Amino acid sequence: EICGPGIDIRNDYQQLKRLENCTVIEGYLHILLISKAEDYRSYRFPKLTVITEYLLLFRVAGLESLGDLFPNLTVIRGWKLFYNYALVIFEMTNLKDIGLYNLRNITRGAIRIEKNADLCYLSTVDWSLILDAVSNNYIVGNKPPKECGDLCPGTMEEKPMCEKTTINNEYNYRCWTTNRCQKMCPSTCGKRACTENNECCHPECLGSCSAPDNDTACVACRHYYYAGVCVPACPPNTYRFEGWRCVDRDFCANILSAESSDSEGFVIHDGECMQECPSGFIRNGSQSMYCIPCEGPCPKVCEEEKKTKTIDSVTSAQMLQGCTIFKGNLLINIRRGNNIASELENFMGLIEVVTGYVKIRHSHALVSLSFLKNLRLILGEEQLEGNYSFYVLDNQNLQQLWDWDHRNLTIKAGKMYFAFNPKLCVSEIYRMEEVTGTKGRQSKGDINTRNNGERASCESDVLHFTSTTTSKNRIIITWHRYRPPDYRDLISFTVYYKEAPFKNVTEYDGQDACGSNSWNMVDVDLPPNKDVEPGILLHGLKPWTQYAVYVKAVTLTMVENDHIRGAKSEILYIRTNASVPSIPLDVLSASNSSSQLIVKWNPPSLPNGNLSYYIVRWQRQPQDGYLYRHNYCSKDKIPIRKKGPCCACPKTEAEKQAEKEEAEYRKVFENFLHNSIFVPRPEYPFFESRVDNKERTVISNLRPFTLYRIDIHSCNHEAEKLGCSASNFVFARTMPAEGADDIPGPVTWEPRPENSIFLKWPEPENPNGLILMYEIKYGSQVEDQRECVSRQEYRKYGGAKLNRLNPGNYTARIQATSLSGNGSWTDPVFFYVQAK
Amino acid sequence: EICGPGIDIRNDYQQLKRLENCTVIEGYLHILLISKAEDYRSYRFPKLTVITEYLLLFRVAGLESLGDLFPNLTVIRGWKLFYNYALVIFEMTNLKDIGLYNLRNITRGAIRIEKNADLCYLSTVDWSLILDAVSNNYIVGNKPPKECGDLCPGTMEEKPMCEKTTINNEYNYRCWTTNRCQKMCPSTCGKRACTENNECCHPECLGSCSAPDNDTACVACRHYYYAGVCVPACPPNTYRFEGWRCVDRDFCANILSAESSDSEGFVIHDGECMQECPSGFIRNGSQSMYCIPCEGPCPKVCEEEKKTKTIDSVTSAQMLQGCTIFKGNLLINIRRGNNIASELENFMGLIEVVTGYVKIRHSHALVSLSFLKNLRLILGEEQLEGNYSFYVLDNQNLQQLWDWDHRNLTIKAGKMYFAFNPKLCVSEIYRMEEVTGTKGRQSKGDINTRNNGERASCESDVLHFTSTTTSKNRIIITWHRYRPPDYRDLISFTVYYKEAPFKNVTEYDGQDACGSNSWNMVDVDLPPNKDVEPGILLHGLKPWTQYAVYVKAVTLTMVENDHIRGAKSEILYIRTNASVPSIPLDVLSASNSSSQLIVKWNPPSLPNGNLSYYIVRWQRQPQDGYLYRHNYCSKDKIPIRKKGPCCACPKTEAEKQAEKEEAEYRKVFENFLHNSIFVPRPEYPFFESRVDNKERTVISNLRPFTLYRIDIHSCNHEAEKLGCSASNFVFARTMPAEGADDIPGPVTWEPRPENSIFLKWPEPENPNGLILMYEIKYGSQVEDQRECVSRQEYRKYGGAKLNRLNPGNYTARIQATSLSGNGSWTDPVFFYVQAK
Ligand SMILES: *[C@@H]1O[C@H](CO)[C@@H](O)[C@H](O)[C@H]1NC(C)=O
Ligand SMILES: *[C@@H]1O[C@H](CO)[C@@H](O)[C@H](O)[C@H]1NC(C)=O
Ligand SMILES: *[C@@H]1O[C@H](CO)[C@@H](O)[C@H](O)[C@H]1NC(C)=O
Ligand SMILES: *[C@@H]1O[C@H](CO)[C@@H](O)[C@H](O)[C@H]1NC(C)=O
């Protein structure tokens, strides 16, 4: 009664007759696309009890309650899911109740029951009892809930004996259809199943059983079904068949291609009767039991149903991702594409062995077959007419095959053809004949000497750099006077150039399959005089970066073809530096402590050389005489006037252009600025301390409260010859001498006529910045009166005067205003004024 | 004393000695880059009173108050601004007060006084009095306001002498420096200026005057200064010189040049002596009295200081934007670039005439010179060695020059040279020897039949389409069995194809880079049997396009070169029913009125046709017998449970990929769905009304409250042969018959034992949807009691019963529950029950 594999039924009812003998469908089931709606409940399948894989119903016109069709379906194992679901009820025409009243558990996956016009009864199905991970149920698109009309026993429906369960605060009835309920085993069983009338089943059991605690009575087992018994594990000498049972070796190996393409054999590995042996293992020949570990080719086979898997785009190779051996032949016709190689090395650079030929055709977008790295041997079993097993035709742009210094290859059962590839010279294939054991397979016509590699120089010479010279933004370079076999041949020179901090760079990469793409181009012609060797003036170059350069003599390949040698000097690299750095960046600092200033900045933007060191000058700056001449005791001044949470909150992109224009205009101001800021350049002393390597430093031994102007010059290695960079500067203050703002000596009080008192006192020894004013607080009972004394006032009188005071005793105090802030109040000053 | 042009001073003080005689600097002034700080207030220039243009001070070390150096600077005209400013004080080293105490008004532009370390006194300058559009003033970066120290006469100690003005709620003093204030003319003058001690000046006046209301006494005029008098307009026979005066024509022409100057001689136009005459007009020789309109685009010279303005990039041509005639020669070396042409037609497609030669070299990124449209004649005054005035060298990809069906050209004073252009066929240049009057000017060597157009592509024939078989997503196309001069030549056939709804299409639209990227390539080989003419099966074509096609016979050009004839069929434009048609989309509708329903949808996605028509089938759908058998008087049901928008951003759904897989799985379901939803297809009746051309329609004559199922078919031009397309559908309800829910007949009451009352009544004639229940409201004094009667209850009894009522009289009412909603209440029903 074990129907397998999964069953498919569409377009009509009568195919249902194939399910008469099926009890546990070993696979999935499709009952779909039945538009006729011809028949009704004349097909019934009580035997069907469990589906191993998912279920899918769709457009089964004329179906109203699945419980009519499939009763007894206790559990769905759902080992293979639809997408992540084990039951798909998509847009059902006329289904009214889901039925499935005998359905008890869904081991795997979720369900999707949407778009059903008139379907209902989904709500009262507490899938928590039946299904874990219930949150993934997708039942949105069906009938609106108000028109659902969900009624069923217990909740005021006939045969009311439904039970009440709770899911998220809803302790109420559960059910399946109008007639019948949704019952669940009591907690007495725990995880164990049960039967009708609450008789608890066997532990190794699930869904239901015929008698309490009987191995053979179980309608469905819990984990594995074998020998008509539910077992917790596969018995010895038996191997787990997929899903829910064990089988003998002989059964595991006898099964062959039936219905779907089973194919010969069915492996056994790790104690399980699997289909094909897992990674890191290989089945012992055709002996259908065993495995042994392997690597590389063994882990994966790259065969294709097509004998010729041709590739015309990166996506065309997707199926070949992570594969090694193709049991067939290859064919490439990739005409256009950029970045394609970087993805060909990934999709199908793992290819190792090939059972046939390989062919390359009209591959204008490719320049080097090096992207085929893993290939080691070619069989040639499948070979082209003329016995050609490696065909390369009409490739205008191909340069050179696999790197032939360390990489080996072999073509076993055929020859190769080459033609119509003017950038691939014979030197790249003549060596291959040595390396793939194929020197004598073919004549020289199969690799024609006329149209192959015609354009390719093969080989270019190397020019000599007669002189070089750097600047701060410019480099002047020259080369030997190249003299071809016929001088009229050469017509010009090109002087490539680009920033290349790292020597790991070569122009033969082909840039954009040749030139362009970040090798900035410039040209210059040979000067008319034959006595002056070529030179140019590259300029505007970014300071502080190593610059690779090479020279190519563009020539005219005609008449004699390869005899036109071509010319290309070595890839020299030159520093920018006859140069003067472009000042620091992001200069900042603070005063962690008095006499201490921590200074930290960021590297200069265009510093004209390479990492050598920095230089910092700092000068004590004057306390402006301005503030001295001011009586702050009377000055008061007056102020004058006239995605982000901001939501959309845009700003004119033309306003960003305006800001760009303003910044650019400022920078051009700076450019015209620093021309005569430093003409041609081939009250305190300045203190200097050259930083070594890093963008940080600290200066000590500074006055507690003196402001410092900090010039910060970036100086390069060539700074000795051509001076140092211009100056970015910043001013900063030290942390005030703490407690230096308190009074150093006592106060003195003297009587004066008209009930007056003169107060005198000493002055701070080392005031922090400056003493702006003195705040005398005094009074008879409470020191309410507060008066101000300017520094000049104190200087003139050594203090101040208070006039017209009332009779009585008095206490007073004084505080100073340091440029750092308030000073400490004076100690109490006791005095008295007599009425007469 | 009129110093001109603008004055420039840098790097030292002694250059200030060029300002003794300068009263009104006719131009701008730069006093910048003075780092020496050598001298102090020994240079004084009381004469300087006004600057016509902006002023720029920067890096003037040793300067502390500008007012000392330049007193009496009454007004700045600022006709030409720095950026949009007439005064720039950027990083003023040591300036303390801006001075400018005698500065009163700024005519044009704003000021930028920023990032000065110690500058102050900006606040007390009410720029509203001096400056309009004052908002653009930008003074952010200078000394912090707290350390500014902004004080001046009056506001400090001494009796006030500055006047009080108000800007944005601050009515207080205004001033310039510590020694002097910022005085302004009283409102008595209105817009008129004034003198000291408040004597009002002349109307035609500004800044200041020496006596009240005197033309000759004005320190500065208001609009124009001429003949030692301020005037509101230029006097007749005199012509406005730039800015602030008039001049005689003799002077206008005698101003030849000085350092930075052009004309030599200024022209009088529109009543003003300008440098050059404006657009649409031409100077007639050396004439300077007047300027006459020219006519068309003559008025734009495109000369360059360089005799050879070479272009290597689009930006390299920027300066030539909007220009017509180049007084020199052209040189192009644009090797790489895409979209470049579309911008060359803009930057330099306006070029009309050229005074010399033109040269093209190494232009691999260009294929057609049509982008130079406006050129009509070439002079050749500047000519190359060998008298070559038009040179085209080393251009691999050039195909064809300007369009020669209608566009003319002439080269006057030289010949032309070509070479190394294999894709430019000689036909494009042989015609030129006719069109530019140069047929015999040069030998054929300069136009050698060799390397010139060497490769190109011969001359294409046209293939013939033997048959064009079709499908609903697939085309099968063929062509005559092409027979080259030598059969081994041809090696394959490529079949270009793309979607091209519009006839405006040609070969080079989207092929590759130079051909652009829109033509989806494919290749196919001739079948082995010579008796079967070539054919291909194109497939998977997106519906709704006139699917363009063409054929090119790829060959092996060699040995005989041009004799290799090549080929290309016509650009046929096969369309749908080659892609035979399909289904609808996007269905929506509503019911504005009873028996009326508006239907509107959108154009379909995949119908494989063209606008032909739509079809809509609507079927009355059943009022489910389900709801009939349900007593809703007692049914209650039970629910179950368990910088942009990120100002309120909920989340970022980076799972867009996961939605991608789910949606794509949905479409794969749909594809395997409609594969066999409709097998091979080469209680109410359905009603039909084919729509004509649009995506809208309406249905009438429908039951007031019946639900309708609407199938929609994208029936089309060829729906007759291969059937109509799949049916998207939707259900919708009509608007209920309003007022049909009220009772049609009276109620009747009867006595019954046990103090009971039986109520009977008629039933609605045409209920909307269905009558679910009846709400009887009744009571003795107030109809408090409300009871429910099901439709089946009424059917069985024609009404209902009330039992065990108290003695007394009673009034009652009844309301019906239509599927559309509540019905109208019954008229009052009067009855009574007696205790016995
Ligand atoms: C079911 O089994 C019976 C008995 O072997 C057989 O006659 C019948 O054809 C089978 N039908 C199906 C659908 O398996
Ligand atoms: C379904 O059965 C398995 C194994 O017996 C059990 O672990 C799972 O809990 C059951 N379903 C639910 C929803 O618990
Ligand atoms: C100013 O004018 C006087 C008198 O003509 C002349 O001697 C002197 O050189 C002039 N200086 C300048 C800077 O124009
Ligand atoms: C400057 O003078 C012009 C013309 O006399 C006048 O229109 C303008 O208002 C003056 N400046 C201000 C700020 O008003």
Swiss-Prot record, chains A, B:
Task: Provide the residues annotated with a glycan attachment (glycosylation).
Answer: N21, N72, N105, N214, N284, N387, N408, N504, N577, N592, N610, N809, N822
Q: What is the effect of changing K115N?
A: In IGF1RES; has decreased IGF1R function
Q: Which residues lie on this side of the membrane: Extracellular?
A: 683-836
Q: Where is the Fibronectin type-III domain?
A: 461-579, 580-655, 743-836
The disulfide bonds in this chain are C3-C22, C120-C148, C152-C175, C162-C181, C185-C194, C189-C200, C201-C209, C205-C218, C221-C230, C234-C246, C252-C273, C277-C291, C294-C298, C302-C323, C425-C458
Protein name as catalogued:
Insulin-like growth factor 1 receptor alpha chain
**Species per Swiss-Prot/TrEMBL record:** Homo sapiens (Human)
Covered residues, full protein: 31 to 927 of 1367
